[PDB]
Amino acid sequence: TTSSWLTLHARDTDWHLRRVLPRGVQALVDLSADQSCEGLTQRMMKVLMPGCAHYRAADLFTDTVSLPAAYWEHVVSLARQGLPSVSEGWEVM
């Protein structure tokens, strides 16, 4: 995170990422709503395992669009574990 979690920060030095980031990572998933962390992600690509798979927020979330029955069962089973993490109306507009 750019705010257990690894409290990274945007504009962090690649050397710091080497120091802190685990070297066993084979894939990186950037879900940052703020796009300023793109530089941080690029620096991660230079320190993570070469060939590490890279997924951006655009690869999971998009504003344009243009199944196994067990999928939603697994989804709800996982959600029932972490429901107490926040209130019902955490962000409703």
Add this chain to the structure above:
Amino acid sequence: LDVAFQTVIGAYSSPGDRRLRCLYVPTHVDRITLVPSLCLATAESGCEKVAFNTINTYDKGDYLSGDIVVFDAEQTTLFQVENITFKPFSPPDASTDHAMFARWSWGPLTPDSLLDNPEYWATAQDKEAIPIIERIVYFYIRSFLSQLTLEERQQAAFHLQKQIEWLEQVLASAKEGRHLWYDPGWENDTEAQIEHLCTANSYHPHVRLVQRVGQHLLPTVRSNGNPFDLLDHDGLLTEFYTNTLSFGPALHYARELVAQIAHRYQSMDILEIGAGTGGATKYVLATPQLGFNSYTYTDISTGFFEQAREQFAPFEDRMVFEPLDIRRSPAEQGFEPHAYDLIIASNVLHATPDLEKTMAHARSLLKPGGQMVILEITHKEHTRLGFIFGLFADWWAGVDDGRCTEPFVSFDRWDAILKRVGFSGVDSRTTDRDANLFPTSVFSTHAIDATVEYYPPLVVVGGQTPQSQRLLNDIKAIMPPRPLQTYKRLVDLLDAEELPMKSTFVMLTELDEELFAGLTEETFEATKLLLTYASNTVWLTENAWVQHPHQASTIGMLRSIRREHPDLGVHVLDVDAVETVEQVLRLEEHTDELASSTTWTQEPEVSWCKGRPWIPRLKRDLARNNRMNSSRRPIYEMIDSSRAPVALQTARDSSSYFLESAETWFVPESVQQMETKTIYVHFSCPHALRVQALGFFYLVQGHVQEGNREVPVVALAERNASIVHVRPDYIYTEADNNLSEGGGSLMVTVLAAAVLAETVISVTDSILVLNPPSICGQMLLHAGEEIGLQVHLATTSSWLTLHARDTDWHLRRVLPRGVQALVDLSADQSCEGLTQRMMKVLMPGCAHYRAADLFTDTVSLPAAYWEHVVSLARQGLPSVSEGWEVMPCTQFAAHADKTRPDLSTVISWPRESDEATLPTRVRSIDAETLFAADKTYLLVGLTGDLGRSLGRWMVQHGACHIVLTSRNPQVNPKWLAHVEELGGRVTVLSMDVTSQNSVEAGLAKLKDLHLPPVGGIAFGPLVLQDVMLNNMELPMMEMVLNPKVEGVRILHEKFSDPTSSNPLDFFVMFSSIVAVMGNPGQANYSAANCYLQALAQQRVASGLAASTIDIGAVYGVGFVTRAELEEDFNAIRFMFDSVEEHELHTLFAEAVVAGRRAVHQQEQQRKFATVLDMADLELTTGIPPLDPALKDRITFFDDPRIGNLKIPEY
């Protein structure tokens, strides 16, 4: 901000360490980030004084990379910098190199009397060619002799002996002289026979020259033209001088003799006369290093001086060009008399009828005791060189002596003439037992003045041991008439009441009980008394460096004493076998021979090994210096890639590929990476290929020596090179010829790429591939068929013939909409825009893979994988020929480009040494992991900043378990956490190495900590009492030695079992350069360091890894840095060179590598039974370039042991 930048340099280089040998200026910054609000607030608030932190990320030397962070008092980061690339103002040329490394290059104490090297014997080809040309003439040689001499008189008298100055007789006599050889039934046919012989090697340069001269000597037969200018000004003359193994081995023996002389005598003012083209100069200067302070290139004519300057430019600073006519007085020609320690006669004494006067002139130029190296004719054989040598213009001048030309003087008559002209006889000569070496046999002669004596009292201490008794009796029988005092032991000397102050001591106490083993019994005080009464001293030891480390401690004590008491002349003689006489007396006589202006080096120390005397010289070990500097500049070394690992590494900037030394330097871990196979690569893929989430691996095809079989194999290599060490799982061991040379590797590479692409994606039902390699398309189609995936091929040139810059609407029209993944293999990166447009038209969320995701220039398995790869490749083999794209590694490095990765390209790694012996960009010793992860490395005495730096470097280089030990380890646990972040578990043992019980308790605590067995030890405990020995006290000696000596003894006894299950990868003992040169007031320290060196050497001789590093002043970290003595040691900068923190790490790595190499060579039956065999274990370091201008301040410059490290002045 510039100060913040200077912080990076400060981190890189400590004050006074000289790590910043070149001026670095910023040339690129990856990122500078500044918070303007905080900076403005600090500027306006007046709290300008702010804190900073910086990381010198890259420090190899080529260009520094720094990450800076400047923050306010409240730790609010005002700004930061990332990878501020400081680069030299100008490229770091060799002038900026660091020459700290040095080695004990051993050589004979005097040049060998006979230079008989089988490597330089006349080969079978030459030894048959010369008797073959004899066969043409040998029949009637008895009759020929006189006529051959007559023909040799073409320069002076032959033109009149039969009126041969006129055309008819000239024409008749040329062929008559040639028939003097060709008469016995061969005659004119010999003209063609000579060419037939020349068709083979070792025949051409000599008899072809004979044929050439025989066809053009007519004008010279009448004395009307230049003897050799007629031969196109050269046809083979230089080749005959060099290539022929009759004129060649003489030059080889000359090189050997000059190497020996310049080794024992250094800083020599050398002067070669008659060099001409400089072939002899070339050979003699071809020695790796020689102690020539100056080299006067001299000849009767100056016409060759331009060629000498162009050829000998590297030695131009050492070399000065001055003509000289040895037939004329040197003083009249501007030369300073008796100013040269060595003179060389390059086959010029035969060109003067004043031989005696020319040699007298050479003596006049030579200093007393100077060596005259004479490359000259001797022991003539008419049937071998007569008619071709007889032609020259001034070589015949000398017939006045009554023999042909200047006589082919025999070595005995050479000795007679040489003695008559003021020299010490022919004590050294080249072998001429059979043939081919008489024409150019070489000799060395000393200038006889103040000659070796071979009066003040002689005092002998020792003689208790039966061999010591025998040597005392031999001294008594062989000593000249001199006052004599004898004592059984040094305690008897202590009891002595009358000892002369001008005593010349001969100490055999080391052959008896050693001093440093019995110092308790007032032996230290007895040594003080000895020094008080000792003006001259000689010491004897029995294989101290290999059997008796205490005797080596005494040697080091004397080494320091020679600095503390320069007026005290000291010699030490270490004998491998005492039973094998008569040389200690001569050394004792030499001790009184205190010649300052004479060439005779004072022989500070000597070793009698293998029945011969040897003297050491600290010559810059250019191998290790080159390895260290490769970290800083593109050091190139000629390495045989076919028999040494040479990887075609990509540049840091990724601009071009270069050949880099891939020597891993004997990493012992091969069990976790079980049975790591060695592959001698014949062909390989330049680019690393991705595999199924495992990583990028290059494709290499080559041979594996399985029980000497050259079994072809194809494997995935992490270190693409001529030679690879790869896990068996990544190897395809079939010898199928269908996987033919070059082409097979091509297909396997293409199929690895295709299999990776199919496997990572498959989930999808259809994909698209953009601009795949020409071979790739069909293979990808085959893989899709075999995995049931619809693969579409797109090309920018069935295939979809797309084009770069195509409109996205066109892509929508043509590209299938069922594609779920895109794979861009385009070697040309201009198609990136096309790929981006594809992403806008393909299925949203479509997976995207680029060429960088499959192919890369930097790297940093199921058995069925290669089976599937080869099965697919066998489908598409016919798509192309075998050599579709084959280029040598040299051509690829010179012309290939990283930005344009030419996929489906294959490198033809050279296999022959001639093809593979190439200039390889050397690799830093610490550029690759050197340590195993299943062993503990024990840094004994290394808990200060030096020890911490070494440990962190170790973990950075594969040391997952480190143990720091000291009597009081004051180590911050935060530093332990930091090093653990690097990947290594580091602990402090608090072990007092001075006690056996403490060491055993610590080693048991290791098991209590569950740490792996100790696989290596870095022994550097230190205590210093800077006081001269006379003013020193025994408690100081105990304090200095017990840590060092007792710790090494305890640890060795703990690991004195080469057959143990956990042999040490290394045993590095941290010695100071005082152990090699001494220092005023550090006799105890030098003795302890020499004990460490001898213990390491004998441990290696025992089959156990060990090494010693003679460190200089470590300004970066440790004693100097923590004691804040940078000014005091820089005051002696000319005495002890700086050893940087990271340079210290490099030195330790090199010592570990040297120990491992020595152990492996011992497994290769290297005896290591004497000091000579272990010149590398003592990595001499910390001696700066010795400037003669500072010779006065340097208190050890007069030592010849450092002669090769002395800067030339004239």
Add this chain to the structure above:
Amino acid sequence: GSMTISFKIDSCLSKEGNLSLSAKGQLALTIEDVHHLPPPEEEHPHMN
């Protein structure tokens, strides 16, 4: 809330010389209409 600026500091050492590049790069500004950096690393335990 961003601004990318390509900057080049051209230099000429003499009036007779041509204008040449001395420095270049990019500037990425996080701006407002009118803790941003990582906290400094903990000081290294041992420091000469």
